[PDB]
Amino acid sequence: MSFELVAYEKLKGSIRESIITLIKSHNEKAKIIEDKLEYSVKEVSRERQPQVLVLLKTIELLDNSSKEPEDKARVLNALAYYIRDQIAATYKYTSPDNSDFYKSLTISLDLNKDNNPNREDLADMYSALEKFLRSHVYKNSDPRKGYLDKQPFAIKHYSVVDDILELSDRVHKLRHEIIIAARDLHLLQ
Amino acid sequence: MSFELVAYEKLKGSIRESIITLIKSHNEKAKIIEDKLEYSVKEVSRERQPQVLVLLKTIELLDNSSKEPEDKARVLNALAYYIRDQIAATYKYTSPDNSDFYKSLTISLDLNKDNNPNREDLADMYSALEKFLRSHVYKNSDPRKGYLDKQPFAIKHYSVVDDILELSDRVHKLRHEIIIAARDLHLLQ
């Protein structure tokens, strides 16, 4: 079981489409400005607002980056996957499919029984995402050197540093598990 | 407060000298073969045996490596510092200076009130040490790819994988703390 990254342009497109649909599910008459989707974000629930703005800021920054297509894809796939998981965690006894946005993330990512991230994949994805965020929070991505004067991720009801720590924790746990699994495979061969 | 790495040859020399002294503290007549110090390790306590063998194997591997002097130094300093800390943890209410080997590690490292590793230093040291060990346990340093057929660190009463996990945990915690401290500096400027 392994995950193929969705190509960046395609994923960008389907995420933007799902955001438009989310906006319209609250207000069918919303006037969408194509190159200013963030201005319509006020239409979605307080809970979804920062997730949407982080996705859109991520897309704007990657679009302006010098990154190669696969690295751009790895970042956007990782964030979509992460936000999807964040929504799943808010459901304590029924399906997260109850959230149309959740469903749209599953679809955008083309997730299915045979196409789904293993520990390695997740470690690579979340690591790339964590690096990306650090690159847009700290001088030289290095918190020792302080914060950038301009904080693209200073978004209301969002803590980019909380996300960096969390992503770092998941990566750390995933790398731990990979080591442990290799040990068991070694000793039990 | 920052730590200057001790140059590799010098550190190698003083660690080898302290090992000889440790051996001789049990058996004043021990016959030391210069290029085979590990054969004399049987003379030290069961507890010190794996620490000594890991230090000596580390030195042999660095000596055979293509590493630049500063990277060699970073690895050896890190391991000496780590083993020193491991000994300190075995003292629950009196000074670890009670251990002559502990004292020798403090001296070899030239540790003092103004020359002592900060979080950054430790993070860099333990990371370099963890990488080094992985490079001598797994194919391409990558546990996903399995274990090397030859395990230089398969040393009795020692688990190199336990050490990789532990080093990884300390690095993870140190990086966490660095982030947290940068945040407080940011918000409290």
Numbering used by the authors:
A (entry chain A), B (entry chain A): 1 to 189
Give passages from the manuscript.
Strikingly, neither protein confers a measurable growth defect on its own. To explore this further, we solved the crystal structure of Lem14, revealing a small, alpha‐helical protein that forms an anti‐parallel dimer and is structurally similar to another effector, LpiR1, whose molecular function remains elusive (Beyrakhova et al, 2016). A citric acid molecule was found inside a positively charged pocket at the ends of α1–4. Lem14 has a positively charged pocket that is required for SidP‐Lem14 synergy in yeast, as mutants that reverse the charge (inset) alleviate the SidP‐Lem14 yeast growth inhibition. The synergistic effect of SidP and Lem14 is dependent on the SidP phosphatase activity and Lem14's charged pocket. In contrast to the SidP‐MavQ interaction described above, the synergistic interaction between SidP and Lem14 does not appear to involve a physical interaction as tested by the Y2H assay and LUMIER. Providing further support to an indirect synergistic interaction, we observe clear cross‐species synergy between L. pneumophila Lem14 and SidP from L. dumoffii in our screen.
In at least nine instances, this regulation is direct—a hallmark of an emerging class of proteins called metaeffectors, or “effectors of effectors”. Through detailed structural and functional analysis, we show that metaeffector activity derives from a diverse range of mechanisms, shapes evolution, and can be used to reveal important aspects of each cognate effector's function. After release into the host cell, translocated bacterial substrates (effectors) regulate one another through several different functional interactions: indirectly, through counteracting modification of a shared host target, or directly through either steric complex formation or direct modification of one effector by another.
